[PDB]
Amino acid sequence: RSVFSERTEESSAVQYFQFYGYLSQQQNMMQDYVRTGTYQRAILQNHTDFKDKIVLDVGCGSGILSFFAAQAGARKIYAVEASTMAQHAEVLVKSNNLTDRIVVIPGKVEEVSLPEQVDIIISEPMGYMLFNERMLESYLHAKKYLKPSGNMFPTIGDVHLAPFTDEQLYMEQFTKANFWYQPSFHGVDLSALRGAAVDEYFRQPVVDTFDIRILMAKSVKYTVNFLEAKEGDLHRIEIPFKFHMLHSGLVHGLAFWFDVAFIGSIMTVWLSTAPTEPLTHWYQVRCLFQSPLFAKAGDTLSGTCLLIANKRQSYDISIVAQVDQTGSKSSNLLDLKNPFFRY
Amino acid sequence: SVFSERTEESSAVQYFQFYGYLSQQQNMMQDYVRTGTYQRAILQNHTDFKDKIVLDVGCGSGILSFFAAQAGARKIYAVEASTMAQHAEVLVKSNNLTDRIVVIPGKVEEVSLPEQVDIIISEPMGYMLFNERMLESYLHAKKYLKPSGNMFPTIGDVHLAPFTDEQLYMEQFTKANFWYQPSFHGVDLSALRGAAVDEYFRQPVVDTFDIRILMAKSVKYTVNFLEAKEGDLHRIEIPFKFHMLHSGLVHGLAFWFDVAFIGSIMTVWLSTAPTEPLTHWYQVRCLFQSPLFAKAGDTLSGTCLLIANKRQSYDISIVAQVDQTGSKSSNLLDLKNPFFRYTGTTPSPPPGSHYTSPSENM
Amino acid sequence: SVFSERTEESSAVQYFQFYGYLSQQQNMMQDYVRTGTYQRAILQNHTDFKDKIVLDVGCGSGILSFFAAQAGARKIYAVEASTMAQHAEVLVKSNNLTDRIVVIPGKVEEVSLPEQVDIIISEPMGYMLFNERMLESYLHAKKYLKPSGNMFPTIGDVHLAPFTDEQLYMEQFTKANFWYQPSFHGVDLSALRGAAVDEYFRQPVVDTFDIRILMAKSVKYTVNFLEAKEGDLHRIEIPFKFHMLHSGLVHGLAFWFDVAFIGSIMTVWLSTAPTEPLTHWYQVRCLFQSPLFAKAGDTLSGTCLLIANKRQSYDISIVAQVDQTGSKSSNLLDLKNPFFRYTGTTPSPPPGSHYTSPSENM
Amino acid sequence: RSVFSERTEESSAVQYFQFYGYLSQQQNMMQDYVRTGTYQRAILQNHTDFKDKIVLDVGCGSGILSFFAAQAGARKIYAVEASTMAQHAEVLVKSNNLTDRIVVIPGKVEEVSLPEQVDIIISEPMGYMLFNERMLESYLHAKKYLKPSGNMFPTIGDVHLAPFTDEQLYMEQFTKANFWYQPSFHGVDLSALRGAAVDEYFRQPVVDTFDIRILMAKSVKYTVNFLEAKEGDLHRIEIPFKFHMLHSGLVHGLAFWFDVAFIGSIMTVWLSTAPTEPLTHWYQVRCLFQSPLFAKAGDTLSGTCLLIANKRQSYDISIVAQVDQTGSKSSNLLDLKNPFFRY
Ligand SMILES: COC(=O)c1cc(O)c2cc(NC(=O)NCCCNC(=N)NC[C@H]3O[C@@H](n4cnc5c(N)ncnc54)[C@H](O)[C@@H]3O)ccc2c1
Ligand SMILES: COC(=O)c1cc(O)c2cc(NC(=O)NCCCNC(=N)NC[C@H]3O[C@@H](n4cnc5c(N)ncnc54)[C@H](O)[C@@H]3O)ccc2c1
Ligand SMILES: COC(=O)c1cc(O)c2cc(NC(=O)NCCCNC(=N)NC[C@H]3O[C@@H](n4cnc5c(N)ncnc54)[C@H](O)[C@@H]3O)ccc2c1
Ligand SMILES: COC(=O)c1cc(O)c2cc(NC(=O)NCCCNC(=N)NC[C@H]3O[C@@H](n4cnc5c(N)ncnc54)[C@H](O)[C@@H]3O)ccc2c1
């Protein structure tokens, strides 16, 4: 009956919150210096957004973002966390003598009761491709506690997509799938599953990094304004694209990364996962076409990337792309819950 | 059903989703030691299959059922609970075996088989043999076994042995010491250092190693799948008395396992020991929170107790003491969250293994 | 002599052995910023050298004396205390300058010059300008300077500025946490963790960095070598009042230095600032034991006090406080045991330096 | 008047013991797992050599070898250390509750007074090429405290030498020296020092590792038996060699490494720094010829490596080698106190 339980299979929320209950996973996020340090400077450089203000921290984990708000001068910080990591955050609040300013509230931000409205919400809700794990919806849901003049850190998110060429990556996944092309594996004919295997392997998003050299067009941008958007905006996300090809070659898929901006009163600070910037634990994400498209320079590649939210805290992705000049069309389904980590 | 009473839905969902992926089936099939040994065991005991009725528990892609067909089975009931059952059906049709192999989608605890069978085949082994608790489904399946029937595999041997690996032990503290700093971005993390140490030590270590890190002949615990009941695997007590062959710090116990296919014609072994070629079961090591000093000739004794839980795994309790000194150590480990440490690098030998000059051996 | 009273033999032995190596001379000579700038300063002020008498203090290979010859000096007394003096003599003969350059082996505090000189040249700068305490030998040498005379360099500017570098700070604790383990080969090391932390923090860090880690306009302390006495460098007090331009954790103070050659024709600068090309002096950073939080507009104030020691270096005392909050930090550092951290990698910019989208800038 | 002060310039002992007073340097030795673990297993596997015995630890540093003797069962351990690291060893003895068994005695083993004789001496006295730092002499000196039936850990040391070919290493050092070949560096003629520069650069031992492929002959061995040898044996060390060349090519120098053996009652354990074994903090050492020697397979390369001990706790090395068939001779002086670390 709570907003989170309606949209989430229990079997997926159990695994999800158990994963973030491990300190080792908190350490891995924290040790991303670009991630942690960029959050810290966005907050401190905009200290006036926090001085003597009331703060809500959505999914605080170890509580590290709350400690940044305390350093900035916040009067009171409500740090909500649904995993068992809440108990460990409490320990750190006590041992850092911040019991009067940081108040850990265990539970799902959709279900807990907060004693007052807040001036600013902070969170790190971004998954792979920004939208994975569907935590952006909890972040937006928490705006019920936001004063009208309130702010949000991060304030906006920019998804970027660009076609790429990478025949090695394409052949690696085709070669894996071609295991099921065999007619006499230990005397057994597997070939009838060759099609299902290629489908499974290519519905996998490839999570790793790559050189910008492989991008064949200026990137297309899709913006979410966290101040303006509703929770229901993210159940069906439609990203049209029209790429002007700058090189000829085989387009093997679309590469995704994202940027978020902390728009404070004093300055705007950007956190970027772009392939031109230092690597973060979000890497970049590439979706492969089962069959590459040929395009020459000056052609336009157009279509739509439709993300339909599912009950496993992820998205069914549909990418349809066509070379307009030739009508060469590629249509793909990617399962954002079973990625292929290649790094 | 028996399966749902002992399994939280969360665990079963993830479990059968995992085995539904063809990529996962392919990983198991591409373990040649595993797949070749099963094939040899079945075909070299063709008399145990010629014109017999067979039950394949958790058939996955069906590969073990196809081996039973190659051996001459009249009828094979291939039970699979993941969505892989539908892909196995496809393979049965395209291999023209629809009259000999019948795929029955569902849990073996819940489905209806139309007759008793002469032999049950399966690959129910997890890490340390027992992980994933599928051995219970294998034993449960004996309700369909004719009284004279057989099981492939027939018996399972778990082997435990003390090891010394200073690097493995110190690695835990090096990772946890991330939290022992007073100003991580202005925050004092040190109150969590102890909790981080505990978390790492609760993890069984899945990788391989050089056998010279073992300090005593292994101790064997045997399950006979023909005799054993489901209930026997809820609480598994493994007493051990190790007679130390080397002096050093015992940092934990190493686990591996063998299974034997005892056919009418011959007995075939599938071994995951560290002295045999590596398999996708590797080996498992459970660390002691505090190491024990032992000299050669000392005895190291205690109990490994495995208590089944509803997440299809086991809580592991290990208590051990050096009898000559009374020095004692324990540990509790969660077999459900193993740490996969395998790098691909050939395991390096323990320091101080050269009894002759390495410069002369050049 | 003045040199032996202020220098323990142990330090002088190692010091003059080090500069006796031609490999070391070559390293200094191959710093093009250093050697080119000195050459330009001397030649572009040829009137300050044409037919003048010159003293080169610590001439090493003699390279600065050859520049003074190229500028027209009548006579050059080239004093060097290491065994490099004999190699400089060889270069004076093979360059046919025996009538203009005279190499006088020995310490400038102890040797006898046959006449007063019109200008003294030297490269006495160490890390943070003052390290190695050769500036005192440069000033001591003014006993040979005619009253109208000049000094090349003429003045030295030390610049200090607060920096934020979370990684540099956390690195100290990560290294020291080697000792925070209870069973390193069966030994509990943790009682030494505190001593290891202290040892690392007493080390000035010699490497370079991105100027965006600086949080305030630098503060300048000037030595005028024409006016300054030897005794002025035994105790050097540098008060500072920084007006913070960025908010963040101040992890310490960064030091660099400039020198100026003020000739009759022009003033030439040799800068080791982080905004200029890298030199073999790099930059020096002294960490605070505990960082200070400061917001933009706050004032950070305190004193850097350098006390000379007999190991030809300085004990550094740094005290600093954020005035708005009273938050205070100190540190004591031994400039004689710096930590050389330079990797060769271009310094990476502080996180949160992007005020516009990096994905748009593509 | 003490044996150490007679053979050591004070200016060299000051630097030497200050270097080993830093915990960071103790950490670097300790973190050599081959070094530390091989000492620990040599001691524990031979526990009977230690059970209820009296032990002397020469230059114990942090005290880690003493703790190994305590684990083996030693009744009493005298842990001598001349650097300020002695104070830190005391701290560890107290915090490990071994005050009744490990007795730190600050000072030089040549100068301190020990209350009784010992059954076994332990130490890590080996430097680069084994003999650098001249600590083997303190180790041997400490035998005045050794019972007649006593043992020593390590018991023997084997130096190995073998000719090598490595034109890249040779050209790197020649290229550095050729800086001083210039006739107009900023208008100055440096060429007169070209000879002195080559001499300086090539008197440097090269400390790093290398592949066995570069060795041109089976290695020659020189043994020191620590039970038998006197302190004065190491003031003048003469190592003759006669190599049977197994490949043709340029011999650019001699490569040195060493092995030590712990000969206990129960078994012998070897610690090796050979290029075929895992790297240690001793690496290997190569001495270059200013001019390479040509040899063909089947030729013999013969000569002598003479090490004369000096007052800087090091050795003046003289290597003379000749290809017997052609009489091609190379003569070299290497200064073991100023090595070139290439790793
Ligand atoms: C299955 O195995 C795979 O193949 C796999 C698949 C994936 O998609 C993965 C994907 C991986 N992803 C990351 O690398 N992720 C890090 C960045 C985000 N980390 C963060 N701080 N955000 C979440 C926190 O917020 C809390 N939280 C959420 N929702 C609520 C709510 N409603 N109420 C209160 N708290 C809430 C959570 O408990 C956390 O405290 C890794 C590994 C992955 C592995
Ligand atoms: C989370 O990340 C980790 O750290 C982690 C942890 C684990 O415990 C893992 C553990 C990992 N696992 C294996 O090591 N896998 C290989 C061993 C052999 N494979 C096998 N045991 N497959 C059984 C088949 O039998 C079916 N089956 C089961 N029960 C029934 C039933 N009642 N009825 C009908 N069919 C049934 C199943 O669907 C299968 O078709 C991997 C990865 C793992 C990763
Ligand atoms: C231990 O390892 C470390 O961590 C470390 C520590 C240091 O402090 C170092 C420090 C390092 N040093 C430099 O940074 N070096 C370059 C700066 C410019 N070079 C210079 N300052 N050279 C002066 C010349 O002048 C002579 N000279 C001195 N005094 C007198 C006198 N009284 N009479 C006559 N001649 C004299 C000398 O012999 C020289 O011919 C390097 C390496 C260092 C390494
Ligand atoms: C100048 O810069 C360079 O270019 C350079 C040159 C070298 O030759 C180096 C060479 C380097 N070498 C090692 O890498 N060395 C580690 C292995 C040996 N470490 C050990 N444990 N042995 C000594 C201990 O024994 C104590 N000790 C000695 N003599 C006595 C005595 N008489 N009484 C009591 N205690 C004594 C000492 O204080 C120590 O506690 C490194 C760096 C080096 C750097």
Author numbering:
A (entry chain B), D (entry chain B): 135 to 477
B (entry chain A), C (entry chain A): 136 to 497
Show me the paper's own sentences about this structure:
Protein arginine methyltransferases (PRMTs) are important therapeutic targets, playing a crucial role in the regulation of many cellular processes and being linked to many diseases. Then, another series of compounds (12a–12h) were designed and synthesized, introducing also an adenosine moiety and exploring the distance between the three groups. We also report crystal structures with various PRMTs supporting the observed specificity and selectivity. On the contrary, we were able to cocrystallize the compounds in the complex with both PRMT4 and PRMT6.
All six cocrystallized compounds (12a–12c and 12f–12h) adopt an overall similar conformation in the complex with PRMT4, revealing two common anchoring platforms, the methyl 4-hydroxy-2-naphthoate and the adenosine moieties, each one occupying the same binding site on PRMT4 regardless of the different linker lengths. On the contrary, distinctive conformations are observed for the linker in each compound (see below for details). On the other hand, the methyl 4-hydroxy-2-naphthoate moiety partially occupies the peptide substrate binding site on PRMT4 and mainly interacts with Y262, P473, F475, and Y477 on one side and F153 on the other side. Surrounded by such a “frozen” binding site, the linker of each compound adopts a unique and distinctive conformation stabilized by interactions with the protein platform in a region mapped on one side by catalytic residues M260, E258, H415, and W416 and on the other side by F153, Y154, and E267. If the linker is shorter (as in the case of compounds 12a–12c), the two guanidine-stabilizing hydrogen bonds established with the PRMT4 main chain are lost, and this may account for a weaker affinity compared to derivatives 12f–12h. Regarding the linker between the naphthylurea moiety and the guanidine group, a length increase from three carbon atoms (n = 1, 12a) to four or five (n = 2, 12b, and n = 3, 12c, respectively) brings additional van der Waals interaction with W416 and Y262, thus substantiating an increase in affinity and a corresponding decrease in IC50 values. In fact, longer compounds 12f–12h showed IC50 values in the low nM ranges compared to the μM range observed for shorter compounds 12a–12c.
